[PDB]
């Protein structure tokens, strides 16, 4: 590309943000390489967890900063200036030198973080100081670069602490910092599948702890161990990643091929529940409780594709599986992803308006129907409407899949989605020259990642014109008081914002370096515990949605 002052000014927004984070996100009380998770944009101070007793702790949670690591390494790629990547190394090396448990687990995640001012460990949730991830997708290749031994031990410790049962693959969410490390964790032999295909859509009963928003990080980690580490150190890891990934595929709906959210249901192990609102899985499968009376055998938890279950399948885990297919040059991973996306959208997508219907994996829709009773999926009277996400999240996997396997039905779905997002016309196939909307005013980071994929696909410079105009609007709307904010009324900025990565990926593409930047994988973080007066609280709301 012929580069312009406007392109440079977007890189300078990102450089300003980085400078702000590295300054304002450092404690004045005790200065170390650690970073704050978030910055108050009025005071310029790092954000705080407030405990019920009123004590405050400044938050440093390395699980919520992986996207900032990716922006630092991206900035060194696009600028050819090594100082950004070197500062990412400095932060990372200090964290890994100091804040790993004896068993190899990091002190980070949903229920653990480091006090930025005192360097003490913090447990936002009383009596639950545990290791918790949930579609976090850490920046493994860079962590491996900084400290390969600690990164190998981490992945082995993550599997060892969260896999409760090596035959059912029940996965606990709350990993113990007292669990013993086992260097030979992946040397266990691969067991048979529990999935009996002639019984689907009914699935095997175990503890039912096989949700894809637990399985996906485990699969990702095992495959990155295989990819990154020597043979001997990584023995067994790709096989165990493959087994776990395959269990989801084996449990797909036997008539529609639609993907599922999990591959086992919870046994009814205790009785009685206190009421319909008591949704502990020990009372049995929650979908069968809430929907079973009207819907029958389809009503089991893995077959529910609404209430954001579809997002974890067709967005988060789809991006991971596509990334692994491409990394490993693995056509079987690829065809299975493509088949899953196609079979989901044939049942759920409405091409007249671009919406996604709330469905079960056999195609039964509950669109518009008030829930008949309370339960895990909502109170009685809740209504699920067909949804069209605010931004092009669901588009990105369809474009990445197309770039790997040119299926014309993926192309038709992407053209229809972009049409309803206001992009204009991609045209009838990937050889068309598109007619794109250069005044599109609702833009997001997903606009830029998607436009870049379509440029890599089609080589049509129109997509770069479109992305440049969108990126200028993105900076104009979200770069506010020196940080990136989803709404200019918000008080507190998270340093895990993805606008910087999206902006730098576009800059890389203008400089012919796209392949060199960390790919966006949809990982994100949160902290959950008791916040001031509120028992069941997330930083997402208690901090990052506060208004100035």
């Amino acid at each position: 590309a012929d580069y312009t002052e406007q392109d440079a000014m977007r890189v300078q927004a990102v450089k300003t943000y980085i400078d702000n984070v590295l300054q304002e996100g450092r404690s004045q009380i005790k200065t170390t390489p650690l970073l704050a998770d978030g910055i108050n944009t009025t005071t310029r101070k790092p954000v705080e967890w407030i405990y019920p007793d009123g004590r405050t702790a400044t938050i440093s949670n390395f699980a919520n900063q992986q996207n900032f690591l990716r922006a630092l390494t991206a900035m060194s790629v696009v600028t050819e200036d090594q100082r950004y990547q070197l500062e990412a190394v400095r932060i990372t090396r200090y964290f890994m030198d100091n804040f790993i448990a004896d068993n190899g687990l990091f002190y980070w995640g949903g229920h653990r973080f480091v006090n930025l001012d005192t360097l003490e460990l913090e447990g936002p949730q009383n009596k639950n100081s545990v290791h918790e991830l949930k579609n976090h997708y850490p920046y493994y290749p860079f962590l491996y670069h900084v400290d390969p031994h600690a990164t190998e031990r981490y992945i082995k410790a993550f599997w060892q602490a969260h896999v409760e049962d090596w035959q059912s693959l029940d996965m606990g969410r709350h990993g113990s910092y007292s669990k013993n490390y086992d260097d030979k964790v992946f040397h266990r032999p691969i067991p048979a599948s529990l999935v009996d295909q002639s019984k689907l859509p009914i699935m095997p009963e175990t503890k039912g702890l096989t949700f894809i928003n637990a399985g996906s990080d485990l699969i990702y980690a095992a495959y990155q161990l295989d990819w990154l580490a020597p043979s001997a150190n990584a023995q067994g890891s790709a096989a165990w990643g493959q087994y776990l990934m395959t269990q989801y595929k084996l449990a797909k709906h036997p008539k529609t091929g639609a993907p599922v959210y999990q591959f086992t249901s919870p046994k009814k192990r205790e009785w009685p529940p206190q009421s319909d609102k008591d949704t502990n899985s020990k009372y049995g499968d929650r979908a069968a409780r809430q929907f079973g009376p009207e819907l029958g055998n389809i009503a089991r938890e893995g077959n529910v594709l609404f209430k954001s279950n579809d997002k974890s399948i067709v967005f988060n885990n789809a991006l991971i599986e596509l990334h692994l297919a491409e990394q490993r040059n693995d056509a079987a991973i690829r065809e299975q992803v493509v088949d899953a996306l196609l079979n989901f959208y044939r049942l759920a997508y409405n091409p007249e308006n671009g919406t996604i219907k709330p469905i079960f994996s056999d195609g039964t829709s509950i669109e518009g129907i008030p829930l008949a009773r309370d339960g895990y999926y909502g109170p009685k009277g809740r209504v699920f409407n067909a949804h069209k996400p605010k931004t092009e999240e669901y588009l990105l996997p369809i474009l990445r899949a197309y770039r790997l396997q040119a299926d014309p039905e993926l192309w038709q779905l992407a053209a229809n989605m972009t049409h309803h997002y206001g992009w204009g016309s991609l045209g009838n196939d990937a050889k068309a020259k598109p007619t794109l909307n250069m005044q599109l005013s609702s833009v997001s980071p997903m606009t830029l990642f998607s436009a870049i994929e379509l440029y890599q696909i089609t080589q049509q410079p129109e997509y770069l014109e479109f992305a440049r105009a969108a990126a200028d609007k993105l900076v104009e709307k979200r770069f506010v008081r020196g940080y990136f904010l989803a709404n200019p009324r918000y008080l507190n900025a998270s340093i895990d914002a993805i606008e910087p990565l999206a902006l730098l990926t576009l800059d890389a593409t203008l400089k012919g370096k796209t392949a060199q930047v960390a790919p966006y994988l949809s990982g994100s973080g949160y902290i959950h515990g008791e916040f001031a007066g509120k028992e069941n609280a997330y930083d997402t709301n208690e901090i990052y949605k506060q208004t100035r």
Partner: peptide, 18 residues
């Protein structure tokens, strides 16, 4: 634990939620 909670999809209250 000791305050029991789920980890369902859609539970963490992102700004993207309707």
């Amino acid at each position: 634990h000791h305050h029991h909670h789920h980890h369902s999809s859609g539970l963490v209250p992102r700004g993207s939620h309707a």
